[PDB]
């Protein structure tokens, strides 16, 4: 019908596998599609607004768009080291 951030097969596979909690999506996120110096992350439900996040991409970013189930961080740094 329409794109949803739960369409991502790894996220989707966990949900089907009856796994959907455990701080993975609270105090941490896992990055989805990335490029354009902004990243779309899945989880981060305990994120504050305009927080500083530190990625496991050796870069930190400021959360801009808090969206249902996804957060669009803005990367303060190059996308070379981000995947």
């Amino acid at each position: 019908t329409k794109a949803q951030p739960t369409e991502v097969s790894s996220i989707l596979e966990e949900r089907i596998k009856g796994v959907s909690d455990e701080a993975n999506l609270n105090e941490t996120g896992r990055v989805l599609a990335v490029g354009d110096g902004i990243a779309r992350v899945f989880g981060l439900n305990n994120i504050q607004a305009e927080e500083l996040v530190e990625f496991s991409s050796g870069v930190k970013g400021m959360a801009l768009n808090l969206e249902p189930g996804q957060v669009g961080i803005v990367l303060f740094g190059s996308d070379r080291l981000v995947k």
Binding site: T6, S9, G18
Partner: protein
């Protein structure tokens, strides 16, 4: 893992389900139960109507799932988690779409091909056997994957037949030949 990607349309759902249940090796079981609950769902006219309709709420959608698990007990809790996922994502209109796709992934993994002998009319058992033979004889079915063919009757093909499978077709529809003939004699 998918044995062959079926590009989205909730076939990403089918894929996810497939790889998850393939690694739990409960794909035949899943498919059977899914088909079975779908069959009795189709044979319920309120979930052969309103299941399609996007009328249901969040709460009403949740309660539909509860009724569905009254209809059958057990058989892959990944397809029961699928029900939750689909209801929450509100795509229940593409539910059978997922089922068909999950089936394709399943029977592709099993190594079975589907096919069709679309024709203007039903064809001989002699014809069926000869085609089964012909396809195995040709490199098109090299074996390691089964052959299934469904002859269907479409009167639209005004005569002749078209065999289709593996994006390999042999098309002897007379209607088309008639068209070209008509065109040159209107020149």
């Amino acid at each position: 893992p998918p044995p062959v990607r079926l590009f989205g349309v909730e076939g990403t759902y089918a894929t996810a389900l497939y790889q998850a249940a393939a690694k739990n090796s409960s794909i035949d079981a899943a498919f059977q139960s899914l088909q079975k609950v779908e069959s009795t769902v189709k044979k319920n006219p309120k979930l052969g109507h309103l299941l399609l309709n996007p009328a249901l709420s969040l709460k009403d959608r949740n309660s539909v799932i509860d009724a569905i698990v009254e209809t059958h007990k057990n058989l892959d809790g990944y397809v029961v988690n699928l029900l939750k996922v689909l209801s929450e994502n509100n795509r229940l209109g593409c539910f059978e779409k997922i089922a068909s796709d999950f089936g394709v992934l399943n029977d592709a993994h099993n190594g079975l091909l589907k096919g069709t002998v679309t024709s203007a009319e039903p064809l001989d058992p002699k014809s069926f056997k000869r085609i089964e033979k012909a396809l195995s004889a040709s490199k098109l079915v090299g074996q390691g994957k089964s052959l299934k063919l469904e002859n269907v009757v479409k009167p639209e093909i005004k005569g002749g037949l078209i065999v289709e499978l593996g994006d390999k077709t042999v098309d002897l529809s007379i209607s088309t030949k008639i068209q070209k003939l008509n065109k040159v004699l209107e020149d």
